Design a protein around this ligand. Structure first.
Ligand SMILES: O=C1CS[C@@H](c2cccc(Br)c2)N1c1cc(Cl)ccc1O
Lengths: 341, 399, 196, 137, 167, 281, 174
């Protein structure tokens, strides 16, 4: 189910809790919010404050707060007052463009990957009434392209241009407390490097934690998809693709992944825990001069319903300005050979 | 060197070409080229330009030159081939060239021109002058001027459209240019209608012929319409003239009387509404509007140096009438001021001289005759080492 | 600490100590917004666009604000302008005409660092900033170097805080470290260039 | 106006540094070739590639050995050989093929274009993508 | 020729692998956005340059980066007239680089013509059609150079005959 | 226009206008015109001593002395007779037309006046054509430096007259284009078996001149071989009209060739841009 | 620009918003008797050949409204005078034309109803109708000694040539 919001790229997107509204940046300095009226999409809000292209947006479901970051080095937390969204400046203390942003599951913090080769972990102090941030620097040597939180809201996965996928502890004792141990490690002091991939090839476009967080997956520019298993001493399963690089990835079950990128269509990957092996299980987009729904690279994928444990519907936005909604059961019906786990 | 530079001024209905130093152009030809219509062999050389191109049976006539729509560069380039090798008979590698561009022509077009001149014709040096600026230089020949200046208001009126162009220190103030939908052709048509409603025995297929001739031989600008009309209605024997042409069909003679149209034709410059339902601003008002839109500091100088260019500014007393009318509008404005509240009186001067018809070519010929011209031209050596971009800017000189 | 300020009239590098400012150690730059707009007019003229200094000043000012920026490495910027078209941007004039602007985007502001370009004597905002801190108190040099902050329209040029940073590294390495690459690493520079 | 001559960026501690550190059996490849065992020669030439050496001499050596084998091949026997390799082999082959494109000589590129065609059919465009993003090649 | 199609096929595949770009804000200069393959101030953002050659003279150099690709072509030039025709034609197009927005104003040293394709191009144009264009371009400049060659020779014979026949 | 014209339009139109107004009985207008022609020729049309009833046409050739050594003065007098007067300072030949004493056929003199330059060259050819017809072999060859760095050599042999041109191609690439045209001239007899034979030597003079003849990468030598059928009293004038325009005819066509290639490039580039823009959604 | 009347006086009376100007005439009507040597009718006839070409006309005085009416009427006269053969005959058609009832302000068929004030009452109506007729009559007969040349049957082409341009692009027959 494809819908064209515009002909230029949708830089990034974010859905609210009930999936009734979608926020998109139209290759702009702005963020447009849409909502369905019957079977039509209608623009309901226009968030204008950034003085640079917005590169990341995330929506905190329960608190209903939207956070955005842009090339203007700024980050803004938007709060809805009546019929209008109002922004609050958050100083990241960086001198290069911000690239990505994600609220933690507990909605007490949000992280911003940047070109300052650092990750800004921001949180609110109801003491001075403003947002502050601590940096996670070592050993990031390049621009941070992607981020994804662990369900415990402490561990944070990051992908950067220095070809690495890392897992850090974003532990902030003043908004949460001593996290329970995890197969990733017992010691989680702030900024602690828990894990670092062992490849020196390909920028890491996207990272994603499994529903339980014992697994982390990432896609790089070298046309590979990887998965680190914390229950197998962080053993890494890799799979080299025969096609173009993937830019986004998400778990749909503890052992299944859906990714998309420059090929312009979503694909399925499965993880065999026993063999510790990754396997390609199919094109999910089965039928300008392209046979895919999207007519340009797909840059972001998000789970709409079912969570990362048993996803039933997921979303994709791309550089073609289009947004697609995929139904997992429908896909299984149209493809009798489809796996999933 | 012992050889004079080539001066080529391309109009919309006339190209003026000749060598620098001469007072008049050696040739004045229609800016048209006749071609035959996948070229093979030497088909590209099968063309004619100027008069030789207006009436050729097996050929189609084009005017690749206008204010309106786009330059056909292929045709412009071929047009130049004969200008150089057929009419001027100049070895292009031995002569520096001075070409003219309209004001508001783009830098890109200047590079396209240089590409043709340097890469096709191998010229040693090239200079692209802006028409309005040459027109000003041309007025330095006037008895009314004592100091050379490149600040003034140029009224260029040919056969298509009339332009009011303000120039300051040698550079046209592009953002303040205004155009008028009244020119030679419009005058001809109006005179044509006037004859249609009064005279008989005029061959339809020869309607324009008579009109254009009447205009060129008997038209002029009068100080007042009623007083003029009264003049004609009283002493008709010495105001009404007669014209006689021959019927292209039957070879017999037809004679017509020429009257009111003599002064009514050129009058539409001052009273556009007479023939144009979509334009009513008198030329005097357009000039005032332009100058008032320019920087206050440059105004008075513009009022003091209004120059004419083009055959349509050639009517007897065109300048006198412009100067008078403009002085009335401006004096009237300063009248209101005093009353409301002593602004120094503004000196309005419309310059007319003997080289008006081809003021642009003459200005170019005089300037290309000086040593300085060779200093400012862009040489083939620099075109080659630096690129066509150097032709984007052509330094003003001569003052 | 130092607060490099520049407007549509003049530029100022004002050193301030705990409390307050100190006239001695305060210098002004003879180049500002208007001078850059003027230089842009000269540059556009060389490109074939003859804008009148008075009649079109505001138009060229708007062109400057929308397209102008500060080059980081002029050698590299010039290569981009001469070998590619990635710097060329179209700009619509009030009368509808569309012009193309390129290399002149970074050339105009460069006057801030090379005054001679517009026939002005001096050493450039950067070298000037350096001399002000180098001559000042020794017990504040370090502190000053990361408490330099900007303000005034003529400082919002993309890449300005960066160009400044690089120019100071070059000066410090040559006129303070003698050229000892192996010690620049530990020369801390931090340009405060806030959001309001 | 000197101080701008020096590129201070080359000493920026906040840059990026690749992880560096310090070939196939020539005689073995020759053995297979002299015996007409082409496929065998291919698999031997693809062994222990100098992905970690600093000198271009050793790398340029392995490239020669590999190139020597590809040229010695018969057009109709290329497909079979390519299909005898595993994915990693195909990826490595593709790297060497592009290597060869840099040293053309007497139809050398003519046959290499045949190798590229078959290698591509086997490893897909992804094998080329990995020629592009390899830091150690 | 037994080696045209194989050449273009290899070049096309490489262009497909190279044209996978995304918007990238400068890591070196605050609020700047520059084509990385041109400035090269961040080695990790640059990809391995690769060459595809048909023979000793014809080849295509492809240099990628995270947000841009530089494509240089060495055109076929059999003799002197083809050499000058090619030089004039490439110069002609480069002078119009602004309208022909994916062209570099100057070729990479060692090549006849170069393209600079950025993420902004792949954003407003179907990247697969850009790939089609480069291949189309390589094929067509060869045909045009051949046609130009025939043209000059054709007009030359008529010019020699016209003069000689009048004696 | 393939063949270049021989007459000067400025001379003819200027005189024509003055003669028509004189015949009409009008008062004469002043005239002052300075123009050029190929090969560094400079003309001047004026009223000697301000007398508007007299019109003078003068020509200046830097190499006139060389033409004079081969009969120029004699030929010119035969052609222009009483119209020829003492040359104006700065010029080699002057024609004077008295508007109060014009011939019945004014058009005929306008025609010869337009050929002033051609007639100045004529003598050297007529001289050697005569040599051939009389069998006077061994005569020293004529050397005419028609351009600062270009020379023409004329030599008469038993059965033929040779005209050699040492031309320069200032533009390196013009040499390449020129070679294409010269090859077609060399093969010209394949279309006109009776036409003159043409030879071409690049960067080196014909052996007979291996003298101070110029040598260089941008120099080109062309040799025309004229036979009796081209040099006799009946073909003489037409042959002279052609041969003295060759050098400029060649260079003219090299330039027109470049202009045509430009049209080709505008078309192909235009099409490339259309394809490029069709790549946009 | 167009020619306006200089006959408006501080004591000039009005009929509607038209100037009840004096005229030298024997025809009946409410027009004051003119003592000077020129009146509004002469003025309209004097300015006609020039004014008739104008498309726009600024109403400066209530005298202009009267001037305009007469100008438009002169055109009506020329329409009729165009087809006639003698000074005598022409005078008759002009008498007839002057008597015919032409539309007045307020009626459809009268152009410029946006610039002319309609009669407020029956008196004002009949009085305006009388003035207009008196103007028509005097204009008509006065025009005859101008249009015809001492050579009978000569509706001078120098007057006939205007038979079809329309002052301000309007008409009384429209
Ligand atoms: O745009 C320009 C720059 S200067 C001028 C021109 C005049 C004569 C020959 C060429 Br070649 C160009 N020219 C021009 C081109 C066209 Cl296509 C039509 C009219 C012009 O004045």
């Amino acid at each position: 189910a494809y819908h064209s919001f515009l002909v230029e790229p949708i830089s990034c997107h974010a859905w609210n809790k009930d999936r009734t509204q979608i926020a998109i940046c139209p290759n702009n300095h702005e963020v447009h919010i849409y909502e369905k009226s019957g079977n039509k999409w209608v623009q309901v809000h226009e968030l204008k404050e950034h003085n640079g292209q917005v590169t990341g947006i995330d929506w905190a479901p329960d608190s209903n707060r939207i956070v955005t970051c842009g090339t203007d080095r700024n980050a803004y937390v938007w709060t809805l007052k009546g019929r209008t969204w109002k922004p609050t400046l958050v100083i990241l203390r960086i001198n290069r463009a911000a690239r990505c942003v994600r609220w933690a599951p507990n909605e007490k913090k949000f992280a911003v990957g940047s070109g300052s080769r650092v990750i800004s972990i921001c949180y609110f102090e109801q003491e001075n009434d403003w947002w502050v941030c601590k940096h996670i620097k070592k050993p990031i040597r390049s621009t941070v392209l992607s981020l994804d939180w662990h369900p415990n809201s402490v561990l944070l996965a990051a992908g950067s241009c220095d070809f690495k996928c890392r897992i850090f502890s974003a532990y902030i004792k003043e908004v949460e407390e001593r996290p329970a141990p995890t197969p990733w490690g017992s010691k989680m002091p702030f900024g602690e490097l828990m894990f670092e991939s062992s490849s020196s090839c390909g920028w890491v476009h996207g990272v994603c934690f499994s529903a339980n967080g014992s697994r982390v997956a990432w896609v790089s520019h070298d046309s590979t998809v990887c998965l680190a298993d914390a229950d197998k001493k962080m053993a890494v399963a890799t799979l080299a693709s025969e096609t173009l690089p993937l830019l986004a990835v998400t778990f749909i079950t503890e052992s299944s992944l859906v990714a998309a990128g420059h090929d312009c269509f979503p694909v399925l990957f499965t993880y065999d825990s026993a063999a510790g092996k990754l396997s390609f299980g199919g094109r999910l987009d089965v039928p300008a001069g392209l046979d895919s729904l999207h007519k340009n690279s797909v840059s972001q994928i998000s789970v709409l319903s079912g969570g990362k444990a048993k996803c039933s519907q997921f979303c994709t936005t791309g550089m073609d300005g289009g947004m697609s909604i995929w139904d997992v059961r429908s896909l299984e019906s149209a493809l009798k050979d489809l796996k999933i786990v | 060197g012992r050889l004079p530079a080539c001066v080529v001024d391309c109009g919309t209905g006339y190209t003026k070409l000749g060598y620098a130093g001469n007072t008049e152009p050696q040739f004045i030809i229609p800016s048209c080229i006749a071609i035959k219509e996948v070229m093979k062999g030497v088909d590209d050389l099968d063309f004619f330009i100027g008069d030789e191109a207006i009436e050729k049976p097996t050929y189609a006539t084009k005017w690749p030159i206008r204010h309106g729509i786009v330059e056909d560069w292929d045709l412009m380039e071929r047009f130049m081939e004969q200008v150089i090798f057929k009419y001027l008979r100049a070895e292009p590698e031995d002569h520096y060239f001075l070409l003219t561009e309209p004001p508001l022509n783009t830098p890109e077009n200047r590079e396209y021109t240089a590409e043709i001149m340097f890469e096709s014709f191998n010229v040693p040096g090239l200079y692209i002058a802006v028409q309005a600026v040459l027109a000003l230089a041309a007025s330095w020949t006037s008895r009314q001027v004592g100091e050379r200046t490149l600040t003034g208001t140029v009224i260029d009126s040919g056969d298509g459209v009339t332009h009011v162009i303000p120039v300051a220190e040698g550079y046209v103030i592009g953002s303040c240019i205004k155009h008028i939908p009244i020119a030679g052709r419009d005058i001809t048509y109006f005179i044509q209608q006037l004859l249609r409603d009064r005279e008989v025995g005029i061959p339809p297929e020869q309607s324009l012929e008579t009109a254009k001739a009447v205009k060129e031989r008997y038209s002029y600008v009068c100080p007042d319409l009623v007083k003029e009309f009264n003049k004609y209605d009283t002493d008709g024997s010495k105001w009404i003239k007669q014209y006689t042409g021959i019927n292209a069909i039957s070879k017999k003679e037809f004679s017509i009387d020429v009257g009111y149209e003599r002064f009514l034709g050129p009058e539409i410059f001052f009273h556009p509404e007479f023939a144009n339902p979509d334009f009513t601003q008198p030329i005097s008002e357009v000039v005032d509007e332009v100058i008032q839109n320019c920087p206050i500091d440059v105004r008075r100088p513009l009022y003091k140096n209004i120059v004419l260019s083009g055959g349509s500014t050639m009517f007897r007393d065109f300048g006198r009438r412009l100067q008078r009318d403009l002085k009335r509008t401006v004096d009237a404005r300063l009248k209101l001021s005093e009353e409301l509240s002593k602004p120094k009186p503004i000196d309005v001067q419309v310059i007319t001289h003997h080289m008006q018809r081809y003021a642009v070519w003459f200005g170019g010929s005089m300037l290309a005759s000086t040593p300085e011209f060779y200093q400012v031209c862009h040489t083939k050596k620099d075109y080659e080492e630096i690129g066509p971009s150097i032709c984007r800017h052509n330094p003003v000189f001569g003052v | 600490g130092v607060v490099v300020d520049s407007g549509d009239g003049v530029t100022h590098i004002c050193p301030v100590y705990e409390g307050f400012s100190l006239p001695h150690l305060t210098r002004r730059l003879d180049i500002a917004g208007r001078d850059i707009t003027r230089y842009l007019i000269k540059l556009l003229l060389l490109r074939g666009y003859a804008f009148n200094h008075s009649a079109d000043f505001e138009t060229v000012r708007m062109i400057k604000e929308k397209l102008c920026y500060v080059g980081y490495n002029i050698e590299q910027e010039q290569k981009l302008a001469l070998e590619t078209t990635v710097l060329v941007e179209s700009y619509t004039l009030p009368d509808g005409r569309i012009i193309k602007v390129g290399g002149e985007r970074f050339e105009a502001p460069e006057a801030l660092f090379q005054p001679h370009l517009i026939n002005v004597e001096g050493v450039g905002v950067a070298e000037l900033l350096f001399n002000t801190i180098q001559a000042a108190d020794i017990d504040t040099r370090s502190e000053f170097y990361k408490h330099i902050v900007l303000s005034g329209g003529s400082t919002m040029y993309p890449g300005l805080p960066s160009r400044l940073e690089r120019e100071l590294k070059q000066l410090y390495l040559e006129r303070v470290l003698k050229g000892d690459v192996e010690k620049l690493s530990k020369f801390k520079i931090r340009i405060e260039d806030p959001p309001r | 106006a000197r101080f701008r001559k020096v590129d201070v960026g080359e000493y920026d501690e906040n840059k990026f540094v690749d992880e560096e550190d310090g070939g196939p059996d020539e005689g073995e490849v020759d053995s297979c070739l002299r015996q007409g065992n082409m496929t065998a020669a291919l698999q031997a030439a693809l062994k222990n590639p100098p992905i970690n050496t600093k000198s271009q001499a050793v790398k340029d050596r392995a490239g020669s050995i590999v190139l020597k084998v590809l040229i010695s091949f018969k057009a109709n026997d290329i497909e079979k050989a390519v299909q005898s390799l595993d994915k990693n082999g195909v990826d490595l082959l593709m790297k060497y093929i592009y290597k060869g494109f840099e040293s053309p000589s007497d139809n050398s590129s003519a046959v290499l274009l045949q190798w590229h065609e078959k290698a591509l059919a086997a490893g897909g465009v992804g094998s080329i993508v990995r020629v592009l993003t390899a830091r150690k090649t | 020729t037994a080696t045209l199609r194989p050449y273009l096929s290899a070049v096309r595949a490489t262009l497909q692998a190279a044209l996978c770009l995304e918007n990238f804000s400068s890591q070196v200069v605050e609020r700047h956005n520059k084509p990385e393959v041109e400035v090269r101030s961040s080695k990790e953002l640059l990809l391995q340059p690769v060459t595809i050659s048909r023979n000793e003279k014809e080849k295509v150099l492809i240099e990628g980066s995270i947000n841009s690709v530089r494509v240089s072509i060495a055109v076929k030039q059999a003799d002197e007239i083809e050499k000058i025709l090619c030089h004039k034609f490439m110069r002609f197009m480069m002078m119009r680089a602004e309208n022909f927005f994916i062209l570099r104003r100057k070729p990479v040293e060692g090549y006849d013509i170069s393209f600079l394709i950025t993420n902004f191009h792949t954003e407003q144009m179907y990247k697969h059609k850009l790939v089609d264009f480069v291949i189309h371009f390589m094929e067509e400049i060869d045909k045009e150079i051949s046609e130009m060659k025939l043209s000059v020779n054709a007009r030359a014979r008529i010019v020699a005959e016209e003069f000689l026949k009048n004696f | 226009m393939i063949l270049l014209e021989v007459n000067n339009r400025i001379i003819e139109e200027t005189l024509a206008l003055k003669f028509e107004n004189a015949a009409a009985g009008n008062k004469p207008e002043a005239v002052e015109v300075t123009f050029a022609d190929f090969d560094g020729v400079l003309y001047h049309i004026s009223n000697p001593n301000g007398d508007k009833t007299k019109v003078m046409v003068s020509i200046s050739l830097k190499f006139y002395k060389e033409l004079q050594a081969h009969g120029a003065d004699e030929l010119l007098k035969r052609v222009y007779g009483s119209y020829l007067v003492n040359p104006e300072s700065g010029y080699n030949v002057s024609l004077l037309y008295d508007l109060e004493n014009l011939p019945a056929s004014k058009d005929s003199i306008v025609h010869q006046a337009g050929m002033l330059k051609r007639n100045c060259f004529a003598s050297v050819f007529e001289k050697y054509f005569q040599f051939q017809e009389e069998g006077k072999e061994g005569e020293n060859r004529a050397v005419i430096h028609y351009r600062d760095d270009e020379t023409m050599y004329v030599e008469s042999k038993k059965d033929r007259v040779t005209v050699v041109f040492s031309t320069v191609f200032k533009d390196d690439d013009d040499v390449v284009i020129g070679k294409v045209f010269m090859q077609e001239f060399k093969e010209g007899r394949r279309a006109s078996h009776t036409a003159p034979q043409v030879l071409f030597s690049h960067r080196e003079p014909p052996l007979e001149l291996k003298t101070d003849a110029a040598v260089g990468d941008n120099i080109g030598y062309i040799t025309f071989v004229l036979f009796p059928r081209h040099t006799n009293a009946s073909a003489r004038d037409n042959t002279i009209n052609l041969i003295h325009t060759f050098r400029d005819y060649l260079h003219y066509h090299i330039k027109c060739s470049k202009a045509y290639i430009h049209t080709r490039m505008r078309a192909k580039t235009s099409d490339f841009l259309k394809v490029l823009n069709r790549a946009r959604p | 620009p167009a020619y306006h009347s200089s006959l408006m006086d501080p004591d000039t009376k009005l009929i509607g918003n038209m100037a009840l100007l004096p005229i030298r005439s024997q025809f009946k009507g409410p027009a004051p008797r003119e003592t000077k040597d020129t009146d509004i009718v002469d003025e309209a006839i004097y300015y006609f050949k020039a004014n008739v070409f104008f498309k726009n006309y600024e109403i400066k005085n209530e005298a202009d409204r009267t001037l305009i009416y007469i100008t438009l009427y002169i055109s009506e006269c020329l329409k009729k005078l165009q087809k006639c053969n003698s000074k005598s005959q022409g005078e008759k058609e002009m008498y007839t034309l002057g008597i015919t009832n032409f539309p007045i302000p307020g009626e459809p068929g009268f152009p410029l109803n946006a610039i002319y004030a309609k009669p407020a009452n029956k008196q004002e109506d009949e009085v305006m109708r009388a003035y207009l007729q008196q103007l028509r009559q005097e204009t008509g007969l006065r025009l005859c000694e101008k249009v015809f040349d001492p050579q009978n049957d000569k509706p001078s082409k120098w007057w006939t040539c205007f038979v079809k341009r329309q002052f301000m692009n309007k008409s009384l027959s429209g």
